[PDB]
Amino acid sequence: SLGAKPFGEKKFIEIKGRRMAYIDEGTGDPILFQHGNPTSSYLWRNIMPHCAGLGRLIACDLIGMGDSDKLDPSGPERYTYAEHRDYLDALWEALDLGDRVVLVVHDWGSVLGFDWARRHRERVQGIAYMEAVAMPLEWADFPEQDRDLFQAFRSQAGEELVLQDNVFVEQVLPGLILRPLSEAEMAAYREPFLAAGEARRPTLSWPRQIPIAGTPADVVAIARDYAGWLSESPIPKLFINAEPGHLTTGRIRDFCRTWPNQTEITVAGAHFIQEDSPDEIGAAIAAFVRRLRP
């Protein structure tokens, strides 16, 4: 079903002098769900229940997002990908995941999860992905309509758009979900970002870090690395395709459709497809997991 209620209860743990929030329910091997920008663990609330009893169900809030602590002092050099990865690697380590992890990823969760998976390949049992950064991007991979806005995030205009006006939460988010969100739903997405200024910094630092047209060079290299590895890895994969979709279409989709040992389904959605087809997404993940854990 749909619903505005969160899944499970938020737990907290100290990492690098900051508290990080996460959902961790049940026993066994982890099914590890990673949200991206501008969302949180909340993104998976109607998907995680389909995996009830199939393992340990985990959804972490990235540093500065959801119920995780803000970075202090926050500024234009904080919340880089390398910074998020440092906090996330340490969190995942502290959680004692073992060596049979199923990853479920989206958006920046996919850059982070694909990267982690390449670096910890032996520990990774399966990868389910949707609307993911399969490879370094080009401006031609972006739907025409959304190009100028994303380019403006990556210019001097970005602070006003995002820190002042919360454009990523209030415009991009609902704009890339096909069904209308409820009041309670937008409230939960708005909450980490209620205040103008540095509270919203993660939602602007993220689009500045997107590996597009060669830049930033460190994130491009990481994405080129995992692109090459994923196209060769025999690790089982579930590609959840979306129609009309958003990021994972055209050339990007061409590429991830070359990856080996892969099942695919198509669901209704643009980018944040979890809000459009939760049950279809949840059911495919659960079947995938059942097949990997007979």
Task: Indicate which residues carry an active-site annotation.
Answer: 107, 131, 271
Residue closer to Cl ion (CB basis): 109 or 126: 109
Q: Which of 15, 65, 103, 177 binds Ca ion (CB under 5 A)?
A: 177
Residue 37 contact among Ca ion, Cl ion, none, beta carbon within 5 to 8 Å by kind: Cl ion
Q: Are 241 and 277 in contact (CB under 8 A)?
A: no
- Interface residue with Cl ion among 37, 110, 241, 274 (CB under 5 A) is 37
Using the 8-state DSSP alphabet, how is residue 256 labeled?
Answer: H
Cβ atoms of residues 42 and 189 within 8 Å: yes
**Using CA of residue 106, residue 40, residue 19, residue 30, what is the dihedral sign?**
negative
For helices 81-94 and 217-230, angle between their N-to-C axes, nearest 10 degrees: 50
If one asks whether residue 205 binds Cl ion (CB under 5 A), the answer comes out as no
The one-letter amino acid code at 121 reads R
Q: Is 177 annotated as a binding residue?
A: yes
- The nearer residue to Ca ion, 8 or 174, going by C-beta atoms, is 174
Q: Pick the binder of Cl ion from 66, 136, 207, 278 (CB under 5 A).
A: 207
Distance in angstroms (rounded) separating the CA atoms of residues 9 and 48: 13
Q: Strands 18-25, 10-15: parallel, antiparallel or unpaired by DSSP? A: antiparallel
Question: Binds 245, which of Cl ion, Ca ion, none (CB < 5 to 8 A, cut-off by type)?
Answer: none
In the complex, the smallest distance separating the C-beta of residue 172 from Ca ion, rounded to whole angstroms, is 10
Applying CB under 5 A, the residues found at the interface with Cl ion are 37, 206-207
Annotated binding site for Ca(2+): 174, 177
Annotated binding site: 174, 177
